[PDB]
JSON list of N, CA and C in Angstrom, two decimals:
[
{"chain": "A", "resi": 835, "resn": "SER", "atom": "N", "xyz": [119.49, 115.70, 97.51]},
{"chain": "A", "resi": 835, "resn": "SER", "atom": "CA", "xyz": [120.55, 114.67, 97.58]},
{"chain": "A", "resi": 835, "resn": "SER", "atom": "C", "xyz": [119.96, 113.27, 97.45]},
{"chain": "A", "resi": 836, "resn": "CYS", "atom": "N", "xyz": [118.89, 113.00, 98.19]},
{"chain": "A", "resi": 836, "resn": "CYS", "atom": "CA", "xyz": [118.30, 111.67, 98.21]},
{"chain": "A", "resi": 836, "resn": "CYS", "atom": "C", "xyz": [116.81, 111.71, 98.55]},
{"chain": "A", "resi": 837, "resn": "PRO", "atom": "N", "xyz": [115.99, 111.03, 97.74]},
{"chain": "A", "resi": 837, "resn": "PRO", "atom": "CA", "xyz": [114.57, 110.88, 98.02]},
{"chain": "A", "resi": 837, "resn": "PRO", "atom": "C", "xyz": [114.28, 109.65, 98.89]},
{"chain": "A", "resi": 838, "resn": "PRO", "atom": "N", "xyz": [113.53, 109.82, 99.98]},
{"chain": "A", "resi": 838, "resn": "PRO", "atom": "CA", "xyz": [113.09, 108.68, 100.80]},
{"chain": "A", "resi": 838, "resn": "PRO", "atom": "C", "xyz": [112.13, 107.80, 100.02]},
{"chain": "A", "resi": 839, "resn": "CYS", "atom": "N", "xyz": [112.38, 106.50, 100.01]},
{"chain": "A", "resi": 839, "resn": "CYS", "atom": "CA", "xyz": [111.57, 105.58, 99.23]},
{"chain": "A", "resi": 839, "resn": "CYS", "atom": "C", "xyz": [110.28, 105.19, 99.95]},
{"chain": "A", "resi": 840, "resn": "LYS", "atom": "N", "xyz": [109.98, 105.97, 100.99]},
{"chain": "A", "resi": 840, "resn": "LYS", "atom": "CA", "xyz": [108.75, 105.82, 101.79]},
{"chain": "A", "resi": 840, "resn": "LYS", "atom": "C", "xyz": [108.47, 104.35, 102.12]},
{"chain": "A", "resi": 841, "resn": "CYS", "atom": "N", "xyz": [109.51, 103.62, 102.45]},
{"chain": "A", "resi": 841, "resn": "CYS", "atom": "CA", "xyz": [109.40, 102.20, 102.73]},
{"chain": "A", "resi": 841, "resn": "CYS", "atom": "C", "xyz": [110.59, 101.77, 103.59]},
{"chain": "A", "resi": 842, "resn": "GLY", "atom": "N", "xyz": [111.07, 100.56, 103.38]},
{"chain": "A", "resi": 842, "resn": "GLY", "atom": "CA", "xyz": [112.17, 100.06, 104.17]},
{"chain": "A", "resi": 842, "resn": "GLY", "atom": "C", "xyz": [112.03, 98.58, 104.43]},
{"chain": "A", "resi": 843, "resn": "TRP", "atom": "N", "xyz": [112.68, 98.11, 105.48]},
{"chain": "A", "resi": 843, "resn": "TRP", "atom": "CA", "xyz": [112.62, 96.71, 105.84]},
{"chain": "A", "resi": 843, "resn": "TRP", "atom": "C", "xyz": [111.56, 96.51, 106.91]},
{"chain": "B", "resi": 941, "resn": "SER", "atom": "N", "xyz": [122.39, 113.57, 104.56]},
{"chain": "B", "resi": 941, "resn": "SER", "atom": "CA", "xyz": [121.09, 114.26, 104.49]},
{"chain": "B", "resi": 941, "resn": "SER", "atom": "C", "xyz": [119.93, 113.27, 104.60]},
{"chain": "B", "resi": 942, "resn": "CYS", "atom": "N", "xyz": [120.01, 112.17, 103.86]},
{"chain": "B", "resi": 942, "resn": "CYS", "atom": "CA", "xyz": [118.92, 111.21, 103.82]},
{"chain": "B", "resi": 942, "resn": "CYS", "atom": "C", "xyz": [119.42, 109.80, 103.48]},
{"chain": "B", "resi": 943, "resn": "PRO", "atom": "N", "xyz": [119.03, 108.80, 104.28]},
{"chain": "B", "resi": 943, "resn": "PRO", "atom": "CA", "xyz": [119.33, 107.41, 103.99]},
{"chain": "B", "resi": 943, "resn": "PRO", "atom": "C", "xyz": [118.25, 106.77, 103.12]},
{"chain": "B", "resi": 944, "resn": "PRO", "atom": "N", "xyz": [118.65, 106.11, 102.02]},
{"chain": "B", "resi": 944, "resn": "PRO", "atom": "CA", "xyz": [117.71, 105.35, 101.19]},
{"chain": "B", "resi": 944, "resn": "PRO", "atom": "C", "xyz": [117.16, 104.16, 101.95]},
{"chain": "B", "resi": 945, "resn": "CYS", "atom": "N", "xyz": [115.85, 104.00, 101.95]},
{"chain": "B", "resi": 945, "resn": "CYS", "atom": "CA", "xyz": [115.23, 102.93, 102.72]},
{"chain": "B", "resi": 945, "resn": "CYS", "atom": "C", "xyz": [115.26, 101.60, 101.99]},
{"chain": "B", "resi": 946, "resn": "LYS", "atom": "N", "xyz": [116.09, 101.55, 100.96]},
{"chain": "B", "resi": 946, "resn": "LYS", "atom": "CA", "xyz": [116.33, 100.35, 100.15]},
{"chain": "B", "resi": 946, "resn": "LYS", "atom": "C", "xyz": [115.03, 99.62, 99.81]},
{"chain": "B", "resi": 947, "resn": "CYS", "atom": "N", "xyz": [114.01, 100.39, 99.48]},
{"chain": "B", "resi": 947, "resn": "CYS", "atom": "CA", "xyz": [112.70, 99.85, 99.19]},
{"chain": "B", "resi": 947, "resn": "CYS", "atom": "C", "xyz": [111.93, 100.84, 98.34]},
{"chain": "B", "resi": 948, "resn": "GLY", "atom": "N", "xyz": [110.63, 100.93, 98.53]},
{"chain": "B", "resi": 948, "resn": "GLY", "atom": "CA", "xyz": [109.81, 101.82, 97.75]},
{"chain": "B", "resi": 948, "resn": "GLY", "atom": "C", "xyz": [108.45, 101.24, 97.47]},
{"chain": "B", "resi": 949, "resn": "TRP", "atom": "N", "xyz": [107.81, 101.72, 96.43]},
{"chain": "B", "resi": 949, "resn": "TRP", "atom": "CA", "xyz": [106.50, 101.23, 96.06]},
{"chain": "B", "resi": 949, "resn": "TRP", "atom": "C", "xyz": [106.63, 100.17, 94.97]}
]
């Protein structure tokens, strides 16, 4: 469904 | 299922 972008804020 | 971390490499 969705890949984690291995990042964030 | 998974939240996008609105980021990445």
